[PDB]
C-alpha cells in the first residue's frame, strides 16, 4: 500500500548502514542509487568518497527523513509488525543501554577522516584497495587530515575502540556453549550495533586499515567476527560487492 | 534528462518558500506533495500544523539536498542558463549585502513557535484563520499538577509575547526599508521590491512569512489601519503576483484539502 522509498549513493558509508538495516528487517523498499559511474571529470566512485556532505533520505507515506541515523531510528520505531525482526531491545530491556552504548561508540568514529588519510598518507595503510593514482590526483590538483600526527592519533583511538569490542566478543565465547549457534556483539541477536560494526570493519578493510588492527594473531575475535558477517546472507546480498572497484 | 524531483508538504512553510523559488526561476520540477488529505485521526491539514515533521527534499541527479534554505541555495548556484532569473545579486554587487542581510533576518524568525503559539494561545491573535476547535483539541497531587501546568503556561506566554515583540522589531526594519524604496521611486513607473527592482530571495522569505502570519492571526497586530502602510501595500502587491498566486494562491484556504 504505502511505499518505502530510499534515495542514496551505493558507496556512501551512511547509506550502506541504512540499506543493511532495511534488509535485516526484511522490509520491501524501492531503492534508488543516484550516483553515476563516472563524474564530470571522468572520476569513478572510489575517487569521490566523503565528498559533498549530503545525506540519504527516506520517504514513507507522509514522512521524509534525512541522515542515516534518523532513518534507522525511524525504521525501528515504525515497522513493528510481529514478523519484522527488531534490531534494538525494548526501550526498558535489560541490555538496551549496552546495545546503544556500542552503536553510538562506533557511529562516532570519524570515518571521513580515515578515508582522506588513506589517500593523502598511504604510507600508513596496508593493502589499500584504492589505486595509487588517487594519491597523486587528490594532492597535486589540491581539521586538516594532512596532519600525519592527527591520523596516527585517531588510528590509535580506533585501536582503543576495538579493544573494547574484542573484549566483548570474548565474553560471548565464554557464555555460550561455544559449539552450536554463536551470538553476535551484544547478545544472541543481530542488532543496530552489529550493523555499525560490520559496515565499519568493511570500510577499514577497503582503506587498508584492517591489517594494522586485526589478523596475524591480533584481535582474533574481531577477525572471526568480520569473517562471519562476510558470510551472513543479508550482508553479502547488500554489501558483498561494495569494496570492488571493478563494479560501478 | 536529469529531472528535478521535490518531495514536500504543500502547507508546510518551508515547502512554500521552495516551490515559490522554483516558480520564480521558471524551473521544471516533478513535485510530490506527500501530505494526506486526512490523517489517521480524521484530521485535515489545518489541524496538523503543530506537526514538527516537515523538511522537504530535492533530488537532482547525483545530489540530495534537505531543508529549505539549503535547497534554495542549491537552486540558485546550479541553474545558470541565461533564460533563468537570478534571485540573488552577484556576490560583488553593491546590493548583495542588503539582500543577504534581510534574507537572513527573515529566515531567522521562529515560525514554528508562532504557529504553536497561535493554537495554544489564540487570545493573542486577531482574525486567526484556524478554527477555534483546533485550540480545544490541543487535593494533594491535584494541586501539584495544577500549579505545575499553571507555571508552564505562564512561561510559554512570556515566551510567545517575547518573540511577538521581536517580530515587531524585524517588521519595523522592513517598513523602513520599504519607505526608502518608496521615496526613491517615481509614483508612476516600475515599483521596486524589498531590496531593489528585482524580486529576490529576501522577497520570497518576506512574502511567505507575511502570508503565514495572516493565516495565524498575527497580521492585524502588525499592519493595517494605518500601521506599517508600506508593509500592507507590499503584501497586497505580492498577493497579485502571478507566480505567488499560482503556487500559493490557495494555501490559506481551509476549504481546499
Author numbering:
A (entry chain B): 23 to 164, 197 to 302
B (entry chain A): 23 to 160, 184 to 302
Direct quotes from the study:
Here, we describe the biochemical and structural properties of the Finnish founding CMT2K mutation H123R and CMT2K‐linked R120W, both of which are autosomal dominant mutations. The disease variant proteins retain close to normal structure and solution behavior, but both present a significant decrease in thermal stability.
The GDAP1‐linked CMT genotypes are mainly missense point mutations. Structural analysis of GDAP1 indicates that CMT may arise from disruption of specific intra‐ and intermolecular interaction networks, leading to alterations in GDAP1 structure and stability, and, eventually, insufficient motor and sensory neuron function.
